[PDB]
Symmetry: C3
Subunit: 295 residues, 3 copies
């Protein structure tokens, strides 16, 4: 497994394991959480991606059950968490909203640390761009969390370039990533300036839903799937390995986040690194994704 | 009333009074113009927003009738004017166009000064971005007007960030505002990079048509109006105060421009400053405005 | 004829002659190529615009037949060429794709030099923005070609501002142009930030298909054509001269590229420089092009 240094304080595995769906698994037992993590570690996948809101605010506690029952396991992994979304779940918020206040960020990180049973997270992301953001307040709160040692590095998620620029303008610490949807189903960022911006700044994006959240396999993408299967058969891997290799081929050093809860699929997650993806093949798949010839 | 320093040379009232419609009032008498201004001053609203083209090129002369008949009144107010649009009104322009030439800017400011009976305006805006702009010519003309003392400060109106960047690149003086449409009916700037750009540069926007030009009240925005009325009743103000408070809550320090010609509505214009607008309420109203949950 | 210095190493004619269609002329004889070039030179049009892919990879060899048979002719002209597109033409590429690799750029320039019978080109453009670009690799290859003397200057074509920014960030040499579609049929760049970006950087765009590739004359643009004909009759030139004068009027110093293969039309190509295009006329034509009044 390739590692990727996002800063002097943060190195991730090139492929990251996502826990959005950890609570969707009918088994949330400590042993089952440990089994998923151990299956990732066996392939050099060490980075786990979380958020405060995941699993109706239970997904970090479910991970915490695994970690708390396995001394030394947390020290083998990087934890990414997020804050900024407030989701209705009598004491529930009356409307889904964003909260990027220093107080909410601090409260979200303290709950994350208690739920996962650790004194630090590796990376904290602002989960969504906030139309009501006070960049000075949010920037100062993120810097203070890095200073405290509770957070090793900070970044953002779903930010447009102007959102990234505004928050970075109010901060000492460099924002080390933007976690954005990227896949053979979600290609707009390759042309619309969102990826160019990060590539120019030498910032690796993290790609969420790199298999479309399972939509790639739905039967709606028969031409893309036919090509992924043919390339997979040629190189002795599955269609998923080729779809992830498509992202890894980009010179912007995309960090894909896989979301499977299936231990058989976790076991082959690193096959993507075995794929040879030449420029012509990348454009074959891109052409199938955009449904027309390049201009 | 809060004041807002746009520069070392220009301080506005946080709420501005707009005179787009001053000529739509069947009464354009000096006494009636003075009554509107005095009703603004009574609430600490001191800034009046004008343009050369308003009232088929008569609105600044209508204001001038008020000022010329009331010695000392002009020295209690800030005057914002605009130039750059040439509107058909035999000697009329054959097509609506933009004119950002040094000669037209100078001619527009001299007519503004003669019509309003003053030797200076507080703020001059380029009224619309001009696809034919020569930024070097326009920039040099704006700088020269600041140097002359005829214009205390310069800004723009309806400019995209790239338009703002291009003209600022050709100027010594800082552009102190961008006057743009912002309201619960016109929310695109909060997400599309137009507001982020100004927030990053620490430039206050001026919001035009903050009640949609009256459209908010039309009966087409029943869900937004139901929420504004409920919040108004809770806090002892009208729906308009809450709609303006929604803009004032933003950390970018938006300066709303109200357009009513109704002396009863001018009298309560400052009620917006009495409203408590918490983050959850701001998102309640935003969610009603965009017609769906935030992402 | 006005000249335009793009750098200390590159001066073009203000109007450029394009050879996209040189192979569409049933006569590709050296004499006929020389006749087109001589007709351009007679009007001070010295810049010829080419690409590797033009004429199914034959257009530069067709020009080469003219040059190779006329000693001293190449030294009277500037040659613009392009690389980066790989077009299917058994050994053909299986999919249209982009190739901005150092190896492909070098191979494309060497074939261009052999086909045209010269040791240098005046300007090399990356033909299209490449979603798979490695800006560091492409930038270093472009810089190396300028250093070698094989290429006097480098620029891009069809790049968005973010594409231009990313490649320029990886290069020592300044990119001297962006060759983009601009015409009375293609006006988006005047408002969408693409032209503002280049105007702010003092980079002249080159306008391709300035007559819509002949579409202006199709009968679909009757209102625009009626106005161009009336202005042409007033000033003793044809509609084409007025349509090109419309581009030349812009303060961003647009360099139009004409594509006619008709020797009678080449002979009047410079009539565009005789047209007086005042601001009101520019907006008359712009208003016809966008199909509505300016805002
Ligand atoms: N920042 C954000 O806003 C944001 C938004 C979304 C997600 N994320 C992060 O990104 C991670 C990945 O996103 P994602 O969960 O959508 O991941 P994904 O890898 O795109 O999709 C995973 C889903 O696809 C299914 N799947 C995988 N392989 C399959 C196959 N061969 N056939 C059929 N179905 C298959 C999985 O089901 P099985 O479990 O049955 O294999 C699971 O439901 C999340 O876990 C989270 O960490 C962040
Ligand atoms: N830079 C630009 O391009 C630009 C464009 C537009 C305007 N502006 C500036 O912005 C200012 C404000 O814009 P605006 O005039 O559209 O202002 P606004 O405050 O959004 O709307 C004012 C209009 O709404 C009506 N109204 C107010 N309260 C109402 C209520 N409770 N019920 C029903 N109708 C109500 C007013 O009628 P009554 O008089 O009967 O109260 C008036 O017609 C202008 O005056 C001008 O200074 C600039
Ligand atoms: N960078 C890029 O991606 C890109 C894309 C397109 C083109 N280009 C460059 O731009 C150049 C110009 O583009 P273009 O060739 O589309 O040029 P253009 O000048 O817009 O159109 C030329 C076409 O219009 C026809 N035409 C000219 N005058 C006419 C008239 N009075 N009535 C009817 N038809 C008339 C010509 O036919 P006749 O020969 O019969 O006069 C020819 O087919 C190209 O040659 C190439 O160098 C670059
Ligand atoms: O340059 C002229 C045109 O040549 C080819 O048709 C290319 O595919 C196209 O992208 C280019 O714009
Ligand atoms: O991160 C996964 C997703 O979690 C929730 O569904 C959030 O509303 C959404 O904005 C986010 O993208
Ligand atoms: O400023 C108010 C409005 O006045 C005129 O209607 C102008 O055409 C318009 O562009 C402007 O926005």
């Amino acid at each position: 497994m390739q590692r990727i240094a996002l800063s002097d304080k943060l190195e991730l595995s090139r492929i990251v394991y996502g826990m959005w769906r950890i609570g969707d698994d009918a088994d949330t037992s400590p042993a089952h959480v440990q089994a998923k993590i151990e299956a990732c570690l066996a392939q050099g996948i060490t980075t786990m991606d979380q958020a405060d809101i995941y699993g109706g605010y239970t997904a970090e506690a479910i991970l915490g059950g695994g970690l708390k029952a396995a001394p030394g396991l947390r020290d083998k992994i990087e934890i990414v968490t997020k804050c900024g979304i407030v989701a209705p779940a009598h004491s529930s918020a009356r409307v889904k909203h964003y909260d990027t206040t220093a107080g909410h960020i601090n409260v979200s990180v303290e709950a994350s640390l208690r739920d996962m049973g650790t004194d630090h997270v590796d990376l904290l992301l602002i989960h969504r761009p906030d139309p009501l953001i006070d960049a000075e307040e949010t920037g100062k709160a993120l810097d203070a969390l890095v200073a405290s040692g509770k957070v090793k590095a900070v970044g953002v998620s779903n930010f447009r370039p102007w959102d990234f620029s505004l928050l970075q303008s109010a901060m000492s610490n460099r924002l080390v990533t933007n976690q954005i949807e990227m896949s053979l189903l979600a290609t707009d960022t390759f042309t619309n300036g969102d990826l160019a911006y990060l590539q120019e700044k030498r910032v690796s994006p993290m790609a969420w839903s790199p298999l479309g959240g399972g939509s790639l396999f739905s039967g709606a993408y028969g031409g893309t799937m036919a090509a992924l299967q043919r390339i997979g058969k040629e190189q002795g891997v599955d269609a998923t390995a080729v779809a992830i290799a498509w992202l890894l081929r980009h010179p912007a050093k995309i960090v894909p986040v896989l979301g499977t809860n299936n231990l058989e699929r976790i076991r082959t997650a690193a096959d993507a690194l075995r794929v040879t993806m030449d420029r012509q093949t990348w454009f074959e798949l891109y052409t199938l994704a955009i449904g027309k010839e390049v201009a």
